């Protein structure tokens, strides 16, 4: 008796973490 078929490929891994927060927006122009 030969070996059974190899099992299905695993499912895709988790999505990566989101990046770190962007830099603060600049101050508006002076009045």
């Amino acid at each position: 008796g030969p070996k059974g078929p190899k099992g299905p490929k695993g499912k895709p891994g988790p999505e990566g973490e989101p990046g770190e927060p962007g830099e603060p927006g600049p101050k508006g122009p002076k009045g």
């Binding site: 070996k3 059974g4 078929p5 490929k9 990046g19 927006g25 101050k27 002076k30």
Partner: protein, 31 residues
Amino acid sequence: GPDGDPGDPGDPGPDGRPGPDGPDGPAGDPG
């Protein structure tokens, strides 16, 4: 016959989405 071999590992997950926006800048100083 013997059971088949374990399947291959799944694909790597997709790289993460962009980080959240930076905080909005403050209004400009008074004149």
